[PDB]
Amino acid sequence: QDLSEALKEATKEVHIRAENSEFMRNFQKGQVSREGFKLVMASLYHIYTALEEEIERNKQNPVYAPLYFPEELHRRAALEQDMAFWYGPHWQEAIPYTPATQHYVKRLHEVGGTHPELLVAHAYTRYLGDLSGGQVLKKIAQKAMALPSSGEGLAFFTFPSIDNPTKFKQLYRARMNTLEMTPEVKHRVTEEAKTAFLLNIELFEELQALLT
Template sequence: MSAELETSEGLDEPEKKISGVPEKENHTRMADLSELLKEGTKESHDRAENTQFVKDFLKGNIRKELFKLATTALYFTYSALEEEIDRNKDHPAFAPLYFPTELHRKKALIRDMEYLYGEHWEEQAQCSEATRKYVERIHEVGQNEPELLVAHAYTRYMGDLSGGQVLKKVAQRALKLPSTGPPCLHPRPNCHLR
């Protein structure tokens, strides 16, 4: 049953249901899931925050080549994740979390790749072995256990986008990256990217 209004016993107002689950209960379940994911990933998050790469990055010690490799890994990761999310957008476990307009990152990452590598970036960017294995896992999950995409989406969107706001400012200063909008690769006055 898609989102429809139903009157529930003991309630003064109709209650919206998503896939047969009352909105209040669905919201509670989502909050519980968010807390479980946060607690379940805490140790991994702490380890990731304490890698030498992240410590150096936060201090502004950023080598452009490593930044390019990290951006490349994100491009391949989000491409796979968003492909599987789109494939599974109607799956009951994932449908309530499907917000492509608000969350999808692939288009922005393509702009980043064009900026970092140039016009023919696809010929230059190579997927690392570690990223390839992660991409394969995302595809495996999307095709066989799509409910597990929730954990991957949580890690990427909540982790990358939340922590990414801090890292963005550091990278902009250290690498002298543009502060707003997409970088313009065509420095013509009437360029559509400005």
């Protein structure tokens, strides 16, 4: 069984749960506020900053290297534009750093520093979702908040070096399936993908509480 299929199948139940967190349910319905949207985007800024520091640390490591696509996929620079948009020119001092975000970041550096063979789990959970459902979420955010089609405020959701998110996804999956893989590694990659999903759920649970 191919890793990209093993992952999708191992995470479908928790994906359904993540979609049905209160925050994402509200989001899906068009009810996101500016405050709530800013909180989630500032959190992703920290998350992707950590993920991408660790992708760089491990770019030459064969347990990750086939998924090294910084130009196409990396989100940090995009999130920086979005922070300047939502929080202003001194965004670096304004943006929050919530404990649930700190928890996700911590685990990202553990994986990247000490278990890099699991990094694929974390890149899968974030990037493949961003290339799929993230596109749906973009439209909803756009309509809810009157964000222009020219893309300001939603750089995160825009992939200017990928023509077609579905074709890229297929490439990325085909490259996932070329990673060296024993049952040990595969079994733990899929466990870690489930933890990645949980760290996202816990962020959303925390954000919802902060907002209400």
